[PDB]
């Protein structure tokens, strides 16, 4: 028996009862099913953790679940409705999101509007602050694939890796080469940097360390080059440009913490400015739904 808390109610459920609407999210491994709970009509994501599965993958699934289970009071973290434990599997019922920001950027082929990014920033900073203040968790993997959006207009931090070497591309300078390698810190400030990179990427439609061909090359650009700010040509508000600049402070000792970010005019304004994220999202997802083009043949050998 599964025990689900959804729609304000508690339900004793059987896993074979859930209507299977097909496999989902082949791009972030772990088996996940889109399912309908027939008693209510909610459509949910159900993760299947096999008893036979890779031990490292299961370890991460369980650690993440532990944090999600105790994060019900954060509006900005995807929720777990409950679990079913069987002889061979654990099925984890999760809130279904429509896409990640990585997928949105890919399907749009261009920028996400500032007003959406403002709502996103408020949600993600609040989720990261919650994780650290309430649970002592330093996320360590902030990036567009971990920022989820839905047709309701909600924006939430993903469960994947929520419980806390890294994705080069979003790594802070002090994760690559800290000014003091003995300081235990890890530190939240590294995630503030990754948020900044993410925002520049999404606001421009281009990851800001251009044309790197290897992981190490990107690390070199983080350390050697100026921080990659929002362009000034492009119509972004002064407040957004400042927020990004602050997040992309190279010296972590001078980079703001979440409590200071939460006072920044970019966040403060978007806590209450009305933005219709739901309509934006629906319109984008429909318009980018379908396209039909044959790939180029490899060039034949030529003796130069």
Swiss-Prot record:
Ubiquitous; with highest level of expression in skeletal muscle. Isoform 3 is found at low levels in placenta, fetal liver, and skeletal muscle. Its cofactor is Mg(2+). It comes from the Eukaryota. Keywords: Acetylation, Apoptosis, ATP-binding, Coiled coil, Cytoplasm, Kinase, Magnesium, Metal-binding, Nucleotide-binding, Nucleus, Phosphoprotein, Serine/threonine-protein kinase, Stress response, Transferase, Tyrosine-protein kinase. GO terms for molecular function: ATP binding; enzyme binding; JUN kinase kinase activity; magnesium ion binding; MAP kinase activity; MAP kinase kinase activity; molecular function activator activity; protein kinase binding. Its EC number is 2.7.12.2. It catalyses: L-seryl-[protein] + ATP = O-phospho-L-seryl-[protein] + ADP + H(+); L-threonyl-[protein] + ATP = O-phospho-L-threonyl-[protein] + ADP + H(+); L-tyrosyl-[protein] + ATP = O-phospho-L-tyrosyl-[protein] + ADP + H(+). The modification Phosphoserine is found at residue 295. Belongs to the protein kinase superfamily. STE Ser/Thr protein kinase family. MAP kinase kinase subfamily. This is Dual specificity mitogen-activated protein kinase kinase 7. It comes from Homo sapiens (Human). The gene is MAP2K7. The chain holds residues 103 to 419 of 419 of the full protein.
């Amino acid at each position: 028996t599964g025990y689900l808390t959804i729609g304000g109610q508690r339900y004793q459920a059987e896993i074979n009862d859930l209507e299977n609407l097909g496999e989902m999210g082949s791009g972030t491994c772990g088996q996940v099913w889109k399912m309908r709970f027939r008693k209510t009509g909610h459509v949910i994501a159900v993760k299947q953790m096999r008893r036979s599965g890779n031990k490292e993958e299961n370890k991460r699934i369980l650690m993440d679940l532990d944090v999600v289970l105790k994060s019900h009071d954060c509006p900005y973290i995807v929720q777990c409705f409950g679990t079913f434990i069987t002889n061979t599997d654990v099925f984890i019922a999760m809130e279904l999101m429509g896409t990640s920001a990585e997928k949105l950027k890919k399907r749009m082929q261009g920028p996400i509007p500032e007003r959406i990014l403002g709502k996103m920033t408020v949600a993600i900073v609040k989720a990261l602050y919650y994780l650290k203040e309430k649970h002592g968790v330093i996320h360590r993997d902030v990036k567009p694939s971990n920022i989820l959006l839905d047709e309701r207009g909600q924006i939430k931090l993903c469960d994947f890796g929520i419980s806390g070497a890294g994705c080069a591309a979003y790594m802070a300078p002090e994760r690559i080469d800290p000014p003091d390698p003995t300081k235990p810190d890890y530190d939240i400030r590294a995630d503030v940097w990754s948020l900044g990179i993410s925002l520049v990427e999404l606001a421009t439609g281009q990851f800001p360390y251009k044309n790197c061909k290897t992981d190490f090359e990107v690390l070199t650009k983080v350390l050697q080059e100026e921080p990659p700010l929002l362009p000034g040509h492009m119509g972004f508000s002064g407040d957004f440009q400042s927020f990004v600049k602050d997040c992309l402070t190279k010296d972590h000792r001078k980079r703001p913490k979440y409590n200071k970010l939460l006072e920044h005019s970019f966040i403060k304004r978007y806590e209450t400015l009305e933005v219709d994220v739901a309509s934006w999202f629906k319109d984008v997802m429909a318009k980018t739904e379908s396209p039909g083009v044959l790939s180029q043949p490899h060039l034949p050998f030529f003796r130069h």
